[PDB]
Amino acid sequence: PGTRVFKKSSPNGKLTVYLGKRDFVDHLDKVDPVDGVVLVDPDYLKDRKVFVTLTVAFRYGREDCDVLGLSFRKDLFIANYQAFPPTPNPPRPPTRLQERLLRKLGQHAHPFFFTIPQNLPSSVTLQPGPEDTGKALGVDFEIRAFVAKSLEEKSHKRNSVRLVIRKVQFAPEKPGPQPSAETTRHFLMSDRSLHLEASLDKELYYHGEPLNVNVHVTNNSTKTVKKIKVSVRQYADIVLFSTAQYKVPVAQVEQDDQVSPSSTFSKVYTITPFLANNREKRGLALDGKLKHEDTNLASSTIVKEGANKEVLGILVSYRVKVKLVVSRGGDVSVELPFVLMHPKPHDYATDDDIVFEDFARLRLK
């Protein structure tokens, strides 16, 4: 019966923001709207209007004071709403949660409503390097509320209230096609051809769930395979105005399973990505945090079938790599893409931007 509602107050105490949720789920066709309530005393702003803003920003560095190349901030979406005096009726009359909050708080309550667009990226955070004295780049969602005479007026630290929200995605109900790949590497003249096949058992894996790869090698040629090495790679694609791709290995399994010439081989390996042995790796993508709570590896970013542009923010992807090590060269490898997500709960071209792009390309590599 009872439900929880989140609340934050201005430092002066006369301004308060009520939110029904902190994590807003994206359904790949619609995003849960940000509906809330603003409590204020009209005599307090005897003549100032009340505005609330939803902002998503590509950021860098810590939040307070870095003696470094501090935050390159690049807003990806900005919305403005006038809580008091009231705006026209749309979007819609106040919803059930807004109505209940207004009943609870009385006439001193004012609703605000934001509809997050579909193409906005999720909340992810790049892991800071062990040498840097501050957190690394990332994209996050955040909400502000303040009273001012105009939108262009300067900010007021003692008056405004700042609250953080997140955008999350959950695993789709339907299963995907089985990831499998093959590759052949024939020698100079012999019709015999080195051939390996690797495949997964599913296309979607939950966080902490192991991955089974069925490596099948058909080496009918005259050379000997020394080792089979299996790796899981995380692809962090950063798109600001140019596309930069960064690969981070997160799990490796190696066994000395030599293969005799003109003979086959078959094995079913097991591998599991986790954060215990990845805390020193710079450029590792992690899920967004509210304050500083621990978060798992960043969930894969999936795009709808109508992936038209969608290229902003940071996009994460995973791939399993199988590689055969052969004496005197002859390396042959396959890659098996997969998606990693949590199950659904059931209860411009400005100069400084180019400079920062060059700086990030230098730093991450």
């Epitope: 929880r4 902490g208 215990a276």
Partner: antibody, heavy 118, light 107 residues
């Protein structure tokens, strides 16, 4: 899904006993394994916890330093090493399992092993 | 400091078809992160409630928890002869997790 455990028994005071908890039906990286002891005629008490996904371990202040918890991720088992068993350490030790994403109570329990000192 | 969890009444008697309510006082204002466990004499405990209101799967619907500020209450709508055991109130918002002193429902 079972949390069969073994290793309990009688140990001379100041000695050492090692409890092993062999899980099955789930994985060690999607769950965190906790140890809870029931003092004779007294309510439950938490002693240790291990999170193999993050690599963190926690201990109670009354057993900190004396108790070391570790898990063999390849065998899907957890081990509790007890050093310098005092007089008050006698209880029945339960191996419990809780979901890693996210914690929703100790939904699976072992069956209890009696630890005695004299 | 460690958040002690006070659970009362400690001992009570009931009857089949009666209502039983067990209160649990948190010393610090934790969230709804409170779980309720049942333990029969001789067996291991058993999860009943999590998040202080959500019913665990497989638990009969007669068990129902609630939260009122820091007051967490376990309610049984209609007592059955299977419900005679010891019930524990555990908070898991802050490490270390602390259990209540226990309450036994008796005939």
């Amino acid at each position: 899904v079972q949390l069969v455990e073994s290793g309990g028994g009688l140990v001379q005071p100041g000695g050492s006993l090692r409890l092993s908890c062999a899980a099955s039906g789930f994985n060690v990286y999607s769950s965190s394994i906790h140890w809870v002891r029931q003092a004779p005629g007294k309510g439950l008490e938490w002693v240790a916890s291990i999170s193999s996904y993050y690599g963190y371990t926690y201990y109670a202040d009354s057993v900190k330093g004396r108790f070391t918890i570790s898990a063999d991720t390849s065998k899907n088992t957890a081990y509790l090493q007890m050093n310098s068993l005092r007089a008050e350490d006698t209880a029945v030790y339960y191996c419990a399992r809780s979901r890693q994403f996210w914690y929703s109570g100790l939904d699976y329990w072992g069956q209890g092993t009696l630890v005695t000192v004299s | 400091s460690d958040i002690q969890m006070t659970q009362s009444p400690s001992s009570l008697s009931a009857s089949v078809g009666d209502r039983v309510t067990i209160t649990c006082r948190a010393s610090q204002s934790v969230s709804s992160a409170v779980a309720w466990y049942q333990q029969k004499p001789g067996k291991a405990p058993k999860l009943l409630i999590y998040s202080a209101s959500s019913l665990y799967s497989g638990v009969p619907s007669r068990f129902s928890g609630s939260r009122s500020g820091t007051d967490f209450t376990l309610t049984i709508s209609s007592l059955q002869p299977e419900d005679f055991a010891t019930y524990y109130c555990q908070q898991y918002k802050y490490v270390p997790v602390t259990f209540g002193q226990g309450t036994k429902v008796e005939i």
